[PDB]
Subunit: 61 residues, 3 copies
């Protein structure tokens, strides 16, 4: 029928758009994962050095 | 009409798919929230210890 | 045709719903960006002070 066909054009087309919204909304999640994951690696290295020196201190006494 | 019906099959079906893309794109946001929120709790505890010891140091003089 | 019209009601309507799922799934990403970005600025300031004092220590010897 013209229904069946319209109806299954919606089916196909919607299914491809769930898929699209997901792919893209994940992609922006991963933009800002990559953006705070960076500010962390930089805190971890600044803190690494802090543990280094304070191992050096404990050891002088 | 056959329009009205097709048209409102699209209505129903699309509305359920906005809903789906959201639910899932939130769910992946929460996968990677849970994944960096962890690396933080581990920096906070490593830093907690650093504050502990440096309270101990200040106090020795 | 009634197809063409139904078909292009789906077209319009779906396109507006990709757009919606995105806008909203980005908006929740930005809710929880803003929420861990905060816990970081608070670790950076707690750590700033730690670098301050340990510059003071190195300098006393």
């Amino acid at each position: 029928h013209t229904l069946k066909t319209a109806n299954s054009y919606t089916d196909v087309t919607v299914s491809n758009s769930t898929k699209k919204a997901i792919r893209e909304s994940n992609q922006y999640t991963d933009h800002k994962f990559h953006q705070l994951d960076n500010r962390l690696d930089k805190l971890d290295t600044r803190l690494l050095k802090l543990l280094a020196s304070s191992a050096a201190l404990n050891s002088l006494l």
